[PDB]
Amino acid sequence: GYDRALSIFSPDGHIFQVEYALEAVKRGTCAVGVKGKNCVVLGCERRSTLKLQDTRITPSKVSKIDSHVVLSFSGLNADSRILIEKARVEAQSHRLTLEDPVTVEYLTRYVAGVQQRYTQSGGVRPFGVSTLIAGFDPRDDEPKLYQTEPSGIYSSWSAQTIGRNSKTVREFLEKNYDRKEPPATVEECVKLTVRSLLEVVQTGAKNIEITVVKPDSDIVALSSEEINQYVTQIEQEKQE
């Protein structure tokens, strides 16, 4: 088999293939994760240079891993499918052996482990993908939001963004998100997520996707009209 070490160390102690993988993520469409008091919301950018798209059938940016956990991403779309498949298989494998669905932390740790393995295996390049993994542990009402990246490091976030112009929307969240008092309701949390994307997106038409995850496997994707009402409300309040 093809054995070549593609991810190796440089004199300055960097692994360029892992760092070039992060550049692929920076090129990816923006993805944001905001967790409230009793919910987590995943916002995702869709570039508007593609008209005549069939939004019915086009792969959605937010993927259910199980009935209670969701995965969004920024970077190479083709690469994301391999992580989502492996994660979905591990979710059903965990239920089969432990007789309990995965914790959000466990599913994160697994995906991060796969991403890490591809940074020191022969013949393979790292995943050009960072993920936001959100949901609720079984029989638990505490919201969970984790981030992974090509190197294989993962960590928990009150709120976080990845992809193109993520530094701009991270700036917004860092001053607009209060640790002591997070978004109390679903409406408040969705609004703050939409607001944070409106700093970067362009137009609030068919460019913003919102997915609301609640305790006990309660995940619903918002339609155009539903999201459009939040865009209309924010722009009228802005003009002051």
């Binding site: 005549l52 069939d54 059938i57």
Partner: protein
Amino acid sequence: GSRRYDSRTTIFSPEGRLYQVEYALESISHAGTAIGIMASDGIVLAAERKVTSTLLEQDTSTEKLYKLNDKIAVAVAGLTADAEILINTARIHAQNYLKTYNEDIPVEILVRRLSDIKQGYTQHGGLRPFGVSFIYAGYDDRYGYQLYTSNPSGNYTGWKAISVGANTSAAQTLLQMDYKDDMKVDDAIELALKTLSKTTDSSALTYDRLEFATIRKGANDGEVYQKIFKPQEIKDILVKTGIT
């Protein structure tokens, strides 16, 4: 040793692009234009043959349009030899699904698997990627009529109308201009040909330089027919729309 002669086909550029994928897409951009248009009551596939010779056997020739099963066809843009490898794989995957579930494979499932094979060649194995872009035209009982494209990266997306190969920039602007959602198949046929007629690098668009196919519900009561147009049938539809 052998390390000296390795092109390393599966590595990132400092900008975080896949060299071989980008160069494969450059290859495909020189290939004959393929257009897919999805209507409310069917799908059109239209493709331009690469600079035809007068002594080429036109009637018993297959370059662009291939049948995957009774409900799904693809238009090819790139290396024909590479496409045939992937097509035979897709034809087998479709029959494996039918054998397992006793149901025709949903369009997206076939597309995802073929796209996942392409992805593999970009992440491991040290081989060159497949120099091929596909337009998938299909029908299933879940989403009805569907258009998809895949490219050497292994990324795939859904479309109401799309072009691959040469002059896609020009072709996509013309489709975006004249396409509407309540469109009929007969209208979509006219759009596909008019688009090729304006984007073509040839002096004039003729029957002998075209491959054409429709997926309609034209057969009796809730069943899908795949019509791969004969030379004489292309000649007729080209006169009827008033291009010749």
